[PDB]
Design a protein around this ligand. Sequence first.
Ligand SMILES: Nc1ccn([C@H]2C[C@H](O)[C@@H](CO)O2)c(=O)n1
Ligand SMILES: Nc1ccn([C@H]2C[C@H](O)[C@@H](CO)O2)c(=O)n1
Lengths: 191, 195
Amino acid sequence: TQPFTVLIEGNIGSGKTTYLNHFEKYKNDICLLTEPVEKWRNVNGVNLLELMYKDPKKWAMPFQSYVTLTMLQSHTAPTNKKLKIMERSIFSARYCFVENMRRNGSLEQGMYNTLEEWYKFIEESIHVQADLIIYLRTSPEVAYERIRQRARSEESCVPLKYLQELHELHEDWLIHQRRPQSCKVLVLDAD
Amino acid sequence: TQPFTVLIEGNIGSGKTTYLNHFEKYKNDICLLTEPVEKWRNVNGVNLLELMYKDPKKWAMPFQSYVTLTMLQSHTAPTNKKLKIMERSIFSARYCFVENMRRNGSLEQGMYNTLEEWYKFIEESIHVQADLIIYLRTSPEVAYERIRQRARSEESCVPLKYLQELHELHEDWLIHQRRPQSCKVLVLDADLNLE
Ligand SMILES: Nc1ccn([C@H]2C[C@H](O)[C@@H](CO)O2)c(=O)n1
Ligand SMILES: Nc1ccn([C@H]2C[C@H](O)[C@@H](CO)O2)c(=O)n1
């Protein structure tokens, strides 16, 4: 079982990290799970994040596959705290990042299908705690800015086009669509 | 949630199907799960099995991942029979087929790694019922004949060396490197023409 869980969603460079760094001083009453980027950067030695951004058509599949795994581990990790805040989720991994990779051709149909089958099996079994989604809404330009200020080795080549597509997907999912009673969405202007 | 389970393992062309047919008649007391191969041939329209054999460096990883999923589905499927018989398992996929694709160079480090991490997680979360393993043991040459006469479209380009690698892998797993926390193992002579 999991306590009240909050999912911090948003584009790359939407200030999620900075934002949830605030909650750090309260780690004693709140379970804080940042994106397991360190895991993605070091999978038994390999940097999947790096490989994916360097050669999407080749590494998008294994990468998103691992991301699903680690997000799933985070969603199901037990805790004694009564509040849980996670940076991003399996929902955004599926509806935004994977879908985007399918559109730009990084994921070949059979690869997209495999990932979708996994998402279906998970939802059919492993229930995921999601009570609140705070959506740090931004504009691609501002997101591009943040990314540029912090020299992230892997994100050193993400085009503005890429951010726009991710942005649109986050919009289609969190705003231009009725949400279930099981989960509320709080939109904040990041910019 | 799972009853006594038997995993039927063997190389490609070891007569699993034929052998599993002898169990059709007991369908009332036995839950028989066949390899979800036809699912692999139809993943919402795409034939992952074909693609895997056609260009493993690109498709081995997605294919095996879907295999894991489908096998996992069988390992945890509903049943109301007091005996369960599965054709293959996540174990043969992990220790034989994935290992083979790693050795032959089809799976690059990160892909093999991703696959292995899923295995760790699957067994840390779920528990897979495995009480006995029946091993239809054959020689790679005999297995090659079966595959040849079977004439399966996707296996059309499977060379003897491939079956040779898989054979060694099954041997190491079910016989040599075997240990007393043993899932008990019954070794059958699948070179026999029909038992
Ligand atoms: N499903 C996901 C989740 C995150 N990321 C990437 C986007 C950023 O580069 C980094 C997070 O800041 O992780 C990704 O490619 N796919
Ligand atoms: N983990 C697995 C399981 C099966 N197969 C292949 C072997 C045969 O070609 C077909 C099963 O009869 O699927 C495979 O490549 N990998």
